[PDB]
Structures are given as C-alpha cells and as structure tokens.
C-alpha cells in the first residue's frame, strides 16, 4: 500500500528521490507519495504519514529519530573560477558574483542567504547576482558558472563537479530528523521505510 | 539593478535557470530574482516584476505575450524498459509502474496525473507506484528506472536519455505566456529580459 512522506523541496529533490528508488526496489508492493513543501505540513493532520525535517520537531506527540548532520559549504564551478579567480576570504566575496535563495525563506532553512550577510551588517548586505528559492536550481546555476553558492551537502552530493571554497569561515551545521505520529508506529509500511531511511542516513558520510 | 521573475517550480528548474545564465552573461550589471511557486503569485501586488505562466493570464491590466506551446509525452528510462518491457497501449499501463505528480495539483498544471486517469473512469484510477509533486523529481525518478512518467518537453529537454512511448493517445498541449504590469513596460531591465525570453521561446523547437 501507499506511504505518504513529506519533506522540504531541497531534501526531496536532492537526496530523497534517489533513496525512494532504492526503497521501492526492496518493497515493490509498496507505493510512495512524496509531498515536497517548504512549509512544514502538519503530519498529525494526516497530510502525510511521516516526515523528514531540517530541525528537531517540537510536537510532543511525534515519535522522532535524528538522521544525519547537514553541513553548509561554499562552492563555485571550474568555469567560474577560470574566469573570475578564487576568493581567499569572506571579504573577497565583495568582488565576486554570489548566488543565494532570496526572501521569503522558510524560518527553519538556516543560512540559505549566508553569502549576502557574511562579514556584513544586516543593513549593508551583499547584492546577489542571482537569487532562486530552489536549492537544486542554485546548484544548477553554480554548475553553469553564474557565481558562488552556499549549499548543503545533500544538494551537492559526493561528486559535485564543484570546487569547495575555503573562506576561513564556519557556516552552522544542522540536524535532520525522521518523525511520525504514534498512530503509525505499528504500521509495517512505516517500519520498513523508517528503518531503511535510518540505515541510509547513517551511511551518508559526506 | 534587480528584476524579479516568477514562474512555476517545474518551468523555473527545468528551463528558466539555464536561460537566466545566458541572460546574465549578456547583462552583467543586472541581477535576477527567480521566485518559483506553483501558486500563481500576484504580479500586480508587486511580488514580482514579471511572470511566465502555463495558462493565459486573465487579468486585463497585464501586458502578455504568448511564448511557446508545451507538449506532454510519456517516457521511460532504458533501465526500466530493459526490465519491464515497453507498453504498446494505454491499457498496457495496467501491467506497468507509473510515476505521477499526485494531489493536490495546481488547477493550471494540466494532465500531471494523466497516467492515473488515461482510459479509466474517475472512480477507478490506476494506483501509481510513485507520486512526487515536483516535475524535476518525476524526471529523476523516471531516469532511475522507477517507472513510466508523463512529462512536459521543457522538463525533458532535447537530449533526455528517455524513450518516448507511443501509447496511441494524445495528451493536450498548452501555451506559455510572458506577462508584466503596464507600470513596468518602460523599464529597460524588463525590456531586455522580455525580448531575450521571447527570442529564446521562439528558438525552443522541441
């Protein structure tokens, strides 16, 4: 039968789709609905059967497990570096083209505009060359050599084709969580998907 | 300066990001914000400066130009066909794994669940093996050989790596439109982007 899984658009497009292929090869009598939303769909309102969240769920009636820690890094394409050079510091970004998410951003999507704010006051941010409210499109724009991007590891992947820039600055990491309502704890379809996702998350050494 | 452009998530990710790279190479003193939303953001409320719509705008105060006609086709990966065979008809889909968008779908996103409904009554739809409310993730799932997908040409592209399936059924085509408020008609930044997008749309023979 059908399991409904909700997560953010970025995590759904960048990581979860490929994991669902691996899952459906193991459980061919299951079907999955991925509901990708940057608004946190209420799992208890039965919009989904489970969720992957980019922050710790605060609802006391959700069973939760930590999955993996996400790191944010700064990237550029070879085709950008070959034309514009490599920035050595956060201050060198003032001479570079930056790509960011823009506003509005979801309140739990941390540091998606980090390149605009890094080393600057909130009233004197960097002017981005491109903004796109889609992490996969920011990766695409970065690969096309439009500019420098700040991206999570689950978007970039193990073989990015991107140079990681060492700007002598740390971007905060955050934890991902699998969560589901107590009503679903005994459903075989949810146990199968939970235990698969927890196993895949532990093996996700980026 | 900054131009804000809104469109659907699918068109933004599948086509417009690559066109914005070409645009920003021509107009390096401009910046772009892409605002990707499947809800039709109101351009007259100044949420954006212009839009690309998948239906004809009904607002009488919007200047509009038809861009291109979009065709929907059915696709499978070589890795799917090599394992499951090729369906020869719409009825053969009953023995196949289908990938669809799911519900809720936006009211202007026509036929994103066509594979569920094709040759069936509304009360006896096909059970999809996978649903994802993201056209780019449906393409990815199709390329991974999860199942058969119905996709627009602007998602698939000229070199899809996908087999187009001839199911002896026509899926309705729809037109795309560029639109902007009359207030913006004289802005140099909007003229540049409009005339570029209109030229790119005419050259988009899929």
Author numbering:
A (entry chain B), B (entry chain A): 95 to 300
What does the published report state?
Unlike many bacteria, Agrobacterium harbors another redox-associated LTTR, called LsrB (LysR-type symbiosis regulator B). LsrB is solely found in Rhizobiales, such as the plant symbiont Sinorhizobium meliloti or the intracellular mammalian pathogen Brucella abortus (there designated as VtlR = virulence-associated transcriptional LysR-family regulator). LsrB is a major regulator of various cellular responses, including the coordinated regulation of small RNAs, ABC transporter or β-lactam resistance genes. Agrobacterium tumefaciens LsrB possesses four cysteine residues potentially involved in redox sensing.
To experimentally support the biocomputational structure model, we employed cryo-EM of purified LsrB. Instead of the expected tetramers, we captured LsrB dimers, likely due to unstable homotetrameric oligomerization in the absence of DNA. We excluded the DNA-binding domain from our analysis due to its high flexibility, prior to refining the volume density map (resolution 3.9 Å) and fitting it with the AlphaFold 3-generated model. The results show that AlphaFold accurately predicted both (i) the dimeric interface of the two LsrB monomers and (ii) the spatial arrangement of the chains. Based on the validated 3D structure, we were able to localize the two pairs of cysteine residues (C144/C273 and C236/C244). We calculated the distances between the cysteine residues in each pair and found them to be below 10 Å. The cryo-EM structure, combined with structural modeling, provides compelling evidence for the formation of intramolecular disulfide bonds involving both conserved (C144–C273) and nonconserved (C236–C244) cysteine residues. Additionally, the predicted spatial separation of over 50 Å between cysteine residues from different monomers strongly argues against the possibility of intermolecular disulfide bond formation. In contrast, substitution of C273 led to increased H2O2 sensitivity reminiscent of the lsrB-deletion mutant phenotype. When LsrB was reduced with TCEP, which breaks the S-S bond and converts the cysteine residues back to their reduced form (-SH), and subsequently subjected to modification of cysteines with MMTS, which “traps” free thiol groups by forming mixed disulfides, peptides containing all four cysteine residues (C144, C236, C244, C273) were identified with MMTS modification.
